[PDB]
Amino acid sequence: VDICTAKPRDIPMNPMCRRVWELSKANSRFATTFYQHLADSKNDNDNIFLSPLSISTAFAMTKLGACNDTLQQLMEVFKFDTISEKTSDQIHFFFAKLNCRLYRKANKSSKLVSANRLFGDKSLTFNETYQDISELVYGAKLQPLDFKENAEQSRAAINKWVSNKTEGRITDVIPSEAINELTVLVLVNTIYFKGLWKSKFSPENTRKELFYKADGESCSASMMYQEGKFRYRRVAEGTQVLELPFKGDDITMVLILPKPEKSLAKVEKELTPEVLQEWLDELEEMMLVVHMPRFRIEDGFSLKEQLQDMGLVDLFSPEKSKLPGIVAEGRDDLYVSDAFHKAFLEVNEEGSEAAASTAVVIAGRSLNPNRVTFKANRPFLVFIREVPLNTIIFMGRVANPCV
Ligand SMILES: *[C@@H]1O[C@H](CO)[C@@H](O[C@@H]2O[C@H](CO)[C@@H](O[C@@H]3O[C@H](CO)[C@@H](O)[C@H](O)[C@@H]3O)[C@H](O)[C@H]2NC(C)=O)[C@H](O)[C@H]1NC(C)=O
Ligand SMILES: *[C@@H]1O[C@H](CO)[C@@H](O[C@@H]2O[C@H](CO)[C@@H](O)[C@H](O)[C@H]2NC(C)=O)[C@H](O)[C@H]1NC(C)=O
Ligand SMILES: *[C@@H]1O[C@H](CO)[C@@H](O[C@@H]2O[C@H](CO)[C@@H](O)[C@H](O)[C@H]2NC(C)=O)[C@H](O)[C@H]1NC(C)=O
């Protein structure tokens, strides 16, 4: 039974505890709710970059061994309870279907790698059903590590493993000394994405240009430039929405650039899944001039603080946590010590994480003289989505791309 074959009865009942999917909707509700809270707590001159899909996946995996209020809190916070027909055992089934299509091994131009792992001290034993379904559905190993007597060796091992999965772009998922002898359970998760643009820019048309920060000042950015046929629409209150697809067309990049006058903080607060979905429905292929800067964002997270604040308390509490999928001789306080996530995105003329020099020659072209222009020389929102599945893979904000 592999992940694409798995049927509903292959994801078992629990211990005692085009078409648009229901799971994808739920994940997008988490994504905009989590993003808004994170952005509201951050200064407007800082870049944000995260993978909500990664976070959702990691915590769905973790709720296999959760129960009672711990499971209830999990289900609520990640908006899994919003999926109409109750059954919380059908979410693992939905993720099997989503993970099978997300992480294929087709020649699909883009590469999408999943790193999803729960690390427990060697004294803990993971239930056999928990291990089995985590492996099948999430491709996740419940990994024993010597935390008690080799804390730092484990941390280096954890960081080394995520490093191998991100091709050396993410080297420190766990920040220094965040793991010790008292660490019991650590959840680590990342998603790594490489892809070439469908319509690449040429480095010879890139040139230093001013970027206007939220503080009022300016800096020098490497502004890329090309002209071509892209899905676009100027929407409510002068906001420019632009989709730049990757080779294959299944993974695209959506940019949300507000007019000069309107603030990006105001757009971040208005952000909803249904406002975003109406914007995509208005987009139309159009011949336009594209100006967008080369940017590189590496944002690392320690999730407990914020997730607790949103209502995920029990899971991180020694008294309150209810995790019957994990067991330890003589211990009744098995809790998650922290959840670590780190995401990376480098965007150039070739695409996402491809650094090549593709010159471009366009012979005999003469475009409309009044064609629309898109110049991203002021903060904008970035969405990396999977079109067929209607899934927000990554999401972020480019508030300062300057060197
Ligand atoms: C980085 O992660 C990749 C996973 O894609 C690791 O590659 C895997 O490495 C193992 C060895 O550690 C390979 O297994 C080989 O199996 C044959 C079959 O018996 C055996 O004769 C070899 O001696 C070895 O055990 C495996 O093929 C390889 N690929 C996969 C898909 O698993 C890579 O090793 C990781 N980096 C480090 C430094 O570990
Ligand atoms: C995994 O969880 C199941 C419960 O869902 C545990 O099964 C219990 O096993 C003991 C004897 O093997 C029985 O007394 C209980 O009746 C079982 N419960 C059920 C509901 O079947 C299983 O032991 C757990 N795994 C570990 C490692 O303990
Ligand atoms: C966790 O929730 C389960 C319900 O799924 C509770 O189990 C109930 O326990 C009582 C007595 O122990 C039984 O009469 C019920 O039949 C059980 N289950 C159901 C389906 O109602 C459990 O008490 C809750 N609390 C803890 C700490 O485990």
Curated annotation (Swiss-Prot):
Effect listed in the UniProt record for changing residue 374 to S: In AT3D; type-II; Torino
Subcellular location: Secreted, Extracellular space
Record note on what altering residue 30 to L does: In AT3D; type-I; Budapest-6
SMART domains from the UniProt entry: SERPIN
Effect of residue 119 to L: In AT3D; type-I
Effect of residue 378 to M: In AT3D; uncertain significance; type-II; Kyoto
Outcome of swapping residue 163 to P: In AT3D; type-I
InterPro entries associated with the record: Antithrombin_3_serpin_domain (IPR033829), Serpin_CS (IPR023795), Serpin_dom (IPR023796), Serpin_fam (IPR000215), Serpin_sf (IPR036186), Serpin_sf_1 (IPR042178), Serpin_sf_2 (IPR042185)
Chain sites annotated for binding heparin: 21, 101, 117
Mutation effect (residue 365 to C): In AT3D; type-II
UniProt effect for mutating residue 374 to L: In AT3D; type-II; Maisons-Laffite
GO molecular function: heparin binding; identical protein binding; protease binding; serine-type endopeptidase inhibitor activity
Family stated for the protein in its record: Belongs to the serpin family.
Functional note: Most important serine protease inhibitor in plasma that regulates the blood coagulation cascade. AT-III inhibits thrombin, matriptase-3/TMPRSS7, as well as factors IXa, Xa and XIa. Its inhibitory activity is greatly enhanced in the presence of heparin.
The protein's name: Antithrombin-III
Upper lineage: Eukaryota, Metazoa, Chordata, Craniata, Vertebrata
